[PDB]
Amino acid sequence: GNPIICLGHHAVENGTSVKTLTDNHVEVVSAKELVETNHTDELCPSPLKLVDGQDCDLINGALGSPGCDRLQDTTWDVFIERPTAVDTCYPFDVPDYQSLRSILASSGSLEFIAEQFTWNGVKVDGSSSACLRGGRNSFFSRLNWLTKATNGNYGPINVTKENTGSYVRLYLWGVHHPSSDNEQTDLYKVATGRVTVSTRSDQISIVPNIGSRPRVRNQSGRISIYWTLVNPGDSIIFNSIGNLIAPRGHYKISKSTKSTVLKSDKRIGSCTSPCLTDKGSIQSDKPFQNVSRIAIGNCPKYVKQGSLMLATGMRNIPG
Amino acid sequence: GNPIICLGHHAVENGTSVKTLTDNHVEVVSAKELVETNHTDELCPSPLKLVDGQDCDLINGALGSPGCDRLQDTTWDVFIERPTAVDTCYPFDVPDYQSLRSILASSGSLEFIAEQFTWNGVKVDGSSSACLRGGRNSFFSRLNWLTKATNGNYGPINVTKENTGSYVRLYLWGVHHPSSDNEQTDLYKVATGRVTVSTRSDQISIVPNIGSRPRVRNQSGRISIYWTLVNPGDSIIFNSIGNLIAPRGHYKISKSTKSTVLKSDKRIGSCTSPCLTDKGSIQSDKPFQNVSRIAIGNCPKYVKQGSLMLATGMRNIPG
Amino acid sequence: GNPIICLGHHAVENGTSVKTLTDNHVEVVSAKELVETNHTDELCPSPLKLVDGQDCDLINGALGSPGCDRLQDTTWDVFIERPTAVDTCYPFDVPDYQSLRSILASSGSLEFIAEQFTWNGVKVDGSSSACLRGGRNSFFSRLNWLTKATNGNYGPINVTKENTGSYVRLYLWGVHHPSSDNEQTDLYKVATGRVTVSTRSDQISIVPNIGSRPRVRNQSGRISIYWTLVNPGDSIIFNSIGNLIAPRGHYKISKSTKSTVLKSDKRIGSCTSPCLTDKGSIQSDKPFQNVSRIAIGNCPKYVKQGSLMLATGMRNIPG
Amino acid sequence: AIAGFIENGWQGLIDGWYGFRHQNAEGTGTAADLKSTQAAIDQINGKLNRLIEKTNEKYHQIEKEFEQVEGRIQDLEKYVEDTKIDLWSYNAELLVALENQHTIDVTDSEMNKLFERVRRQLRENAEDQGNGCFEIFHQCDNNCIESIRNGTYDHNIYRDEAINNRIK
Amino acid sequence: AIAGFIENGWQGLIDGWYGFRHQNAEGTGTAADLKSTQAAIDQINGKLNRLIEKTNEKYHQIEKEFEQVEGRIQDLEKYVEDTKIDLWSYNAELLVALENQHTIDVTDSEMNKLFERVRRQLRENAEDQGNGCFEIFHQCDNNCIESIRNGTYDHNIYRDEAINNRIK
Amino acid sequence: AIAGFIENGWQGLIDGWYGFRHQNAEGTGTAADLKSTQAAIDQINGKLNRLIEKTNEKYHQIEKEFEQVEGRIQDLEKYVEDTKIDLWSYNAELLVALENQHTIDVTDSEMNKLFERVRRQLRENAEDQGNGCFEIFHQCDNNCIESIRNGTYDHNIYRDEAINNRIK
Numbered sequence A, B, C: 001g002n003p004i005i006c007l008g009h010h011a012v013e014n015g016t017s018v019k020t021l022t023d024n025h026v027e028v029v030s031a032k033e034l035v036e037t038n039h040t041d042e043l044c045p046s047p048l049k050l051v052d053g054q055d056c057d058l059i060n061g062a063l064g065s066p067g068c069d070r071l072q073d074t075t076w077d078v079f080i081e082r083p084t085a086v087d088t089c090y091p092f093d094v095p096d097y098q099s100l101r102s103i104l105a106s107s108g109s110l111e112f113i114a115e116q117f118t119w120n121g122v123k124v125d126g127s128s129s130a131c132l133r134g135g136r137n138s139f140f141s142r143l144n145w146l147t148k149a150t151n152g153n154y155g156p157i158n159v160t161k162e163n164t165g166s167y168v169r170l171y172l173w174g175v176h177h178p179s180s181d182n183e184q185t186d187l188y189k190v191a192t193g194r195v196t197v198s199t200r201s202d203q204i205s206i207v208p209n210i211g212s213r214p215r216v217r218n219q220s221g222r223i224s225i226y227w228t229l230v231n232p233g234d235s236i237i238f239n240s241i242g243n244l245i246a247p248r249g250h251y252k253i254s255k256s257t258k259s260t261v262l263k264s265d266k267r268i269g270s271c272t273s274p275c276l277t278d279k280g281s282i283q284s285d286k287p288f289q290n291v292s293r294i295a296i297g298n299c300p301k302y303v304k305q306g307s308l309m310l311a312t313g314m315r316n317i318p319g
Numbered sequence D, E, F: 001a002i003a004g005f006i007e008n009g010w011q012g013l014i015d016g017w018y019g020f021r022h023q024n025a026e027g028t029g030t031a032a033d034l035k036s037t038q039a040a041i042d043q044i045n046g047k048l049n050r051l052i053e054k055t056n057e058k059y060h061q062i063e064k065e066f067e068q069v070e071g072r073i074q075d076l077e078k079y080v081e082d083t084k085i086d087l088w089s090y091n092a093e094l095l096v097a098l099e100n101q102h103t104i105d106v107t108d109s110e111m112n113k114l115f116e117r118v119r120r121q122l123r124e125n126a127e128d129q130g131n132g133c134f135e136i137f138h139q140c141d142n143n144c145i146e147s148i149r150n151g152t153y154d155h156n157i158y159r160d161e162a163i164n165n166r167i168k
């Protein structure tokens, strides 16, 4: 006779396994993945301003090597370097390569403010058969090769530039290391060169070393690229009796800049994504990801786990 | 007829909002802030032994520049550098500036142990119009400018000092970089200098570079400050044929020292506080703080959050 | 008349104290320690392949100093350096000592691939009274001291080696810094030396500095050890007019290698342990340890705590 | 024969997380309870909200991949990043494991609250059978079952009928 | 008309966290319960104690502010500190959120323990009304109400009076 | 005179974590309950399993001990490691404290589940004494006590005897 009333909860035939602190295998009605594993495979140019270096890395571009003409005046949040990039000019090493690359990347700009220098007592606009532009001998667009005047000697240089702007100045310069004692004298008359760039803050001086390196684009010598920062108010002095690779102007610095460089071989699509990785973009609202530790922008946190299932429902007890 | 007995809990008219993992807005009877936001605005000289560098930064003081006389023999847990500090002596750069600054800071002492050197064949106690002490030409109190003897030449130097003490020795020395080829010869006769300081452990040699820098306190040349550590037992040799800025003794090192340097523009009051920040002292028992990532001493942990309310009571259900 | 049935839980006379978030002193029936404090005191040679440097540190061995002959061709997961190790050859400093030491350690091998060089115009196989091998003058087994030919001059060197193997090459070389201007001329005729090693990637040039250091094994001069990496395809050129300490071959690099170096004074036993520390091995299944922050292999995480008791039972309420 | 949550769950119930199932002389029925359901659901959303808040944004950082070996500085950079990855991986494993233990606790609690709510409504007119069900000791037609479900069941109405059925 | 915790809280109650409120023929009154209150309070202090323990003391660290750009080493130092700040910020957000969920659980439990304690004292002499209150089925003057509150109420004293009032 | 968990624990009980203790006309006895015990135990193992999983393996790292001072780079390396040690020390302190709070909750719950399980079996044949014990209002010999313990006790068998002993 007596009525019954029962209280219950829902269940499904096939649950989902999740982890608590004490059970590695609790079956719950519904669950949600928290580790993103998918990427797009193309780098999204929104909302991040991208510059594709293509054949040129960020430094070749900043120096103005042949391949790199387009890159002039480009600005970016992320500069993309491709692994297919190649040297196309006179061979060079850079001491503190990654330090300079970082500085250029952070500034997020290849807008070269050109300046005019009067180099007393030297031939200007040197070129080389290693740095072809349309098959014709050329040089770095942002550097000026100085050799002895078609006349006397490497007329001593003592050129100065005062930073009158409100911003900090980056000057890129270099030093020629010739192969033979004869190549030194042909170009610079003197037997030993010297380059001395200096501000009020600090200084560098390089005595160029002669000797043979392996031929690169048919060249036994080398150039060594250096840089100087010049604060507003301060002045820079280039002082050389031989072997200077003079600049053609400065870059802007800011220091209050957020830009960076990414090393990817993935095409620039037309998608949208705030998270860029070397493997591709990430389009997810999940809090974690196993794709790549290299992750630029608004990204999920990189973790080792492949899956982290989050219970979105009660225990499944199906009967 | 029947009596009633009810069981309840307390409540207030106006609760306080706190966060759990699942509700961003739970109203509880009482709550407590855990993120400290207040600082004192003056640096407390208790219980931390402070030294105010005032017009002198830690290196000028260690070198003995004009402004810096007071700082001699001072000891500290925290050395305070002011942003109003100024160079007052011969212009100089320091390679590894921040490395030396760190070493001096950690030692927590400007107690200069004076030693006597017999520099064979040179004029001693050089001065300069850039380094005024009472309006009269002076030099770094801890350095000794060597120029050719009022006579012949820069008589070759080969001076040695054996560390007989039980502690590690820091020797501060330098190198003059003259402006002109004529200034080099006036001071050092020789055309190219050389400085070579060395222990049994390691060595440095500097060939001074001639050339022009911008005039600073009416000076085109520069000095480059270097340092050498000398272990107990070991010996140091200064070896120069030109351009040495000799030392006047060593500093003590310890290595088992906890002191540091703080960069603040805040006055030293008379309060008490174990936590000093660039913005001021922190007087709190809370575990977190949003004031400054720069925090010296027994401090709350710096976090990004402005507020983290901690429930100190039950849910408020006022009816 | 009426029967009773009671429900209870077990208890012990003497409990164990554990911590929750709110009580620093909860007495529970059973508890388990999670911080390992015991170490073995001997370094277990299983499952980690150990090499005991004994009297030689990792660099002396890589250079081939007298003590170090055994170490040739040894391979390791962990190279052990003893604090009793000693210099036994010509005195030397190494710029970036810890960088080279790291590279050698990571490679996990002292298998020296020997190469033959024809050094045009110099005496080979120089020795010294500081580097005794059986009481007789010797040198680093992996270096070749070049002095002027029993004849003319330091015949200019321009030797090259192309990396034809599939792996990256590490070449160890050096530079002699003689004591006197007379010792320079005796050995190298020239008044100033020069050493220039270079690949297509980068370069170094060292002008050797003359002067006096304190005598070490009766020697006022010094050698400065340098290293060059040579990629597959690339070539290395040694170019010297004086003071080269030539190599005898290269080491293999890999870069996909997990090995390391440990600084311990503990004997190599015959135990088994995946966790090695400077204090000894750790044989534990606990997740934490207070023994040493220096911990190599599969180890428990180092923490500051001495004890962290984990309740393995209910509250103890003994009555 | 009907049971409740003590035994197992209800695949039948598809329009709610919790609910009533009854038997009377008019038949048998299952209805979902909205309050208890929305209660649970609302704490699952709020923690799903606590997780899609992206305070992680990183522009220029450090190099994480290298082409040549360097020794000291590369070793440190590799260490810093590997340390960061380990610590976040731990935070994720613990957060999820800890959220999930809470999600289970909250849903187990809401079920029991629902049961106790009904217990109180029914006073001395029903006995707990032990299987998540109440035996009601009075005739309870479909209007009476709905009153229990919508919270208007006046126990005084049936107290005499039910007590006389329990004591004799 | 009086209610208990099921309905809402009590602004009236100012000398305790929990308490009794009664109605009898002598009047109506509210008294606080010390045991239940101190229970809760003692776990709020102990966790307030777990938080003012300062194991954080740091003298010489690293530079955290820079005047000129430098590239690699500055980039790393900035990264290490920003990583440290992110990880502690997370620890604080979680610790507080997790403490607070515990503080709520503990106080909700102590309330229910208090209710169940009274339930047991009263045996078959009272019925649970559903509103956090017990209807007591016997005359209970002010001494009798105090016995319930101070834990000396002997249910055998009133069992016959109360059972006869419940069953008829 | 016998009590239950409300009062205190049982040092007597050595073959189980929970159990029954009874008094009838045949004597007095203590038997352990296997289900409730294994329940608790199984969550203590599973978390003991979650802790001996060693995802920490580290070959080449960074230098952690120095012989001479260096300034910037040493200062950073010392900082990175000290930061790592602080953050793991925190994780350990919290994990243990949080596990332990759970271990206590789970065991307190299993005890109460055991009590409520028996409550349900006994229906209207027993009253809760308040001390973790049930007064059984009918003669219950050793077979009857074992039926309660092994879950076969049919309350209908004794309902008339027990209700008549409770109401008069």
Ligand SMILES: *[C@@H]1O[C@H](CO)[C@@H](O[C@@H]2O[C@H](CO)[C@@H](O)[C@H](O)[C@H]2NC(C)=O)[C@H](O)[C@H]1NC(C)=O
Residues within 6 Å of the ligand: A037, A290, A291, A292, A305, A306, A307
């Ligand atoms: C990220 O995690 C996913 C899933 O955990 C990985 O994808 C699996 O990879 C394994 C190994 O090849 C395969 O057996 C499976 O078929 C994959 N499953 C899925 C769903 O993709 C992936 O490898 C991880 N990625 C990284 C970069 O670690």
Ligand SMILES: *[C@@H]1O[C@H](CO)[C@@H](O[C@@H]2O[C@H](CO)[C@@H](O)[C@H](O)[C@H]2NC(C)=O)[C@H](O)[C@H]1NC(C)=O
Residues within 6 Å of the ligand: B037, B290, B291, B292, B305, B306, B307
């Ligand atoms: C620390 O946090 C406090 C509080 O969140 C911040 O002070 C607030 O500042 C904002 C911006 O001006 C205003 O909305 C309020 O007037 C302030 N609130 C209070 C309570 O003072 C403070 O800016 C933070 N400090 C730092 C250095 O970030």
Ligand SMILES: *[C@@H]1O[C@H](CO)[C@@H](O[C@@H]2O[C@H](CO)[C@@H](O)[C@H](O)[C@H]2NC(C)=O)[C@H](O)[C@H]1NC(C)=O
Residues within 6 Å of the ligand: C037, C290, C291, C292, C305, C306, C307
């Ligand atoms: C690791 O922790 C253990 C235990 O907390 C420490 O050992 C104690 O050391 C103190 C100080 O010498 C002694 O009073 C005790 O007798 C020790 N107790 C035990 C149980 O061994 C040990 O010092 C710690 N080790 C390190 C390296 O910190």
Ligand SMILES: *[C@@H]1O[C@H](CO)[C@@H](O[C@@H]2O[C@H](CO)[C@@H](O)[C@H](O)[C@H]2NC(C)=O)[C@H](O)[C@H]1NC(C)=O
Residues within 6 Å of the ligand: D142, D143, D144, D145, D146, D147, D150, D152
């Ligand atoms: C709550 O339930 C009651 C009882 O089921 C509802 O009232 C009854 O509704 C049925 C059909 O709608 C009528 O036939 C009965 O005569 C009604 N009886 C009474 C006593 O009202 C009531 O409408 C429901 N209330 C709400 C707010 O949903």
Ligand SMILES: *[C@@H]1O[C@H](CO)[C@@H](O[C@@H]2O[C@H](CO)[C@@H](O)[C@H](O)[C@H]2NC(C)=O)[C@H](O)[C@H]1NC(C)=O
Residues within 6 Å of the ligand: E142, E143, E144, E145, E146, E147, E150, E152
């Ligand atoms: C616990 O409460 C009882 C009952 O209220 C207290 O005993 C009564 O106290 C009143 C007031 O003092 C007297 O008028 C009664 O005659 C007492 N009756 C009995 C039966 O004792 C008792 O004192 C209280 N106990 C404690 C420890 O506070």
Ligand SMILES: *[C@@H]1O[C@H](CO)[C@@H](O[C@@H]2O[C@H](CO)[C@@H](O)[C@H](O)[C@H]2NC(C)=O)[C@H](O)[C@H]1NC(C)=O
Residues within 6 Å of the ligand: F142, F143, F144, F145, F146, F147, F150, F152
């Ligand atoms: C559960 O308990 C019952 C009652 O104690 C067991 O059955 C009794 O066992 C005793 C002793 O073996 C006999 O003397 C009785 O005659 C039995 N009576 C009945 C009604 O069975 C029963 O065996 C137990 N069941 C299980 C599965 O262990």
Ligand SMILES: *[C@@H]1O[C@H](CO)[C@@H](O)[C@H](O)[C@H]1NC(C)=O
Residues within 6 Å of the ligand: A158, A159, A160, A237, B212, B220
């Ligand atoms: C230029 O050179 C002269 C001679 O070397 C030197 O005296 C002067 O200081 C230099 N000044 C500038 C501004 O270049």
Ligand SMILES: *[C@@H]1O[C@H](CO)[C@@H](O)[C@H](O)[C@H]1NC(C)=O
Residues within 6 Å of the ligand: B158, B159, B160, B237, C180, C212, C220
């Ligand atoms: C000093 O110089 C002489 C001459 O070069 C040299 O032989 C000697 O070793 C040096 N010793 C010391 C202690 O200065």
Ligand SMILES: *[C@@H]1O[C@H](CO)[C@@H](O)[C@H](O)[C@H]1NC(C)=O
Residues within 6 Å of the ligand: A212, A220, C158, C159, C160
């Ligand atoms: C070798 O030396 C010659 C002579 O100076 C030089 O021209 C050449 O570049 C060097 N090259 C190699 C491969 O040794």
